[model samples]
Target: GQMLQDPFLNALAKEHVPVSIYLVNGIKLQGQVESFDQYVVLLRNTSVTQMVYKHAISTIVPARSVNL
Candidate 1:
């Protein structure tokens, strides 16, 4: 269901690039993409790991464009 963004997310996850996700409510989350599924993204760093819902995310900004 709505797996359209899988390529982009997978690229970042595979390359282990730092990513920033902006939520609909204006909060920004930053981390390497540890994992993801249809419903949630596992955003992780050395100090904290956040399970962010895809439904609440408005944008994903990676450190750089990753090769497909």
Candidate 2:
């Protein structure tokens, strides 16, 4: 089976869905996925943008279900 990472993230990005990125430490960060690659994600809120490393991310929950 193919990796779900790219497809899922891309779907979320394409749909402009809001997401909550939960870290390994249990802290949840909320934003939309502006961009992403093998290494990191560009997560954006209203006025702040954060470059989140993939390693620290545990799960990404979208505000609504997204279809690929």
Candidate 3:
């Protein structure tokens, strides 16, 4: 999978990122996603029954609400 070969993912794997699989209302999800907004509606709707990734400490804040 492209994701498994991603540089960040590879780095995280090397660093032993505690990866986990989650099932939200029967839908499976993975951690280290490419973007948060991709599931904004699901989160807003409270349909995020599960989160595969535990939140990590972030030193950087988003510079813009939307990015291209």
Candidate 4:
């Protein structure tokens, strides 16, 4: 067996990064990577925290809030 290209295993639990998650319903959730597992991801910020399924969503991408 070999490692997959994605290095994000429990990645959010290790460190937080600005990110955006797009859902199939066309709703976009933007936050930092909080806690990630194979099937779900936890997102949080100073205001709120949320859990989302990895496969149910359409895409996951980085955030450019400050354009950095």
Best by lDDT: 2
lDDT (Cα, tens digit) per residue for candidate 1, span 30-66: 8899999989999997898889999999999998887
Kindly list the per-residue Cα lDDT of model 4 for residues 1-68, writing each as its tens digit.
Answer: 36541454334345565767889989898888777666888888679888888777787776432221
lDDT of 3 by residue, 1-68 (tens): 55523454334334433333334444434333332322221111124333233233222212222221
lDDT winner between 2 and 3, please give it: 2
The TM-scores of all predictions, comma-separated, are 0.87, 0.91, 0.24, 0.68
Alpha-carbon shift of residue 15 in model 3 (angstroms): 0.3
Per-model C-alpha RMSD: 2.4, 0.9, 13.1, 4.8
Q: Report lDDT per candidate.
A: 0.89, 0.91, 0.31, 0.67
Give lDDT for model 2: 0.91
**Which residue runs of candidate 3 sit more than 4 Å off their true CA positions?**
1-5, 23-68
Residue 48 accuracy (lDDT) in model 1: 86
Question: Candidate 4, 34: how far from true, in Å?
Answer: 0.7
**Candidate closest to the true structure, highest TM-score:** 2
The number of clashing residue pairs in each candidate reads 0, 0, 0, 0
Any runs in candidate 1 off by more than 4 Å, and if so which? 1-4
lDDT of 2 by residue, 1-68 (tens): 78877999999878889999999998899989999999999999998989999999999999998876
- Give the clashing pairs for model 3: none
TM-score of decoy 2: 0.91
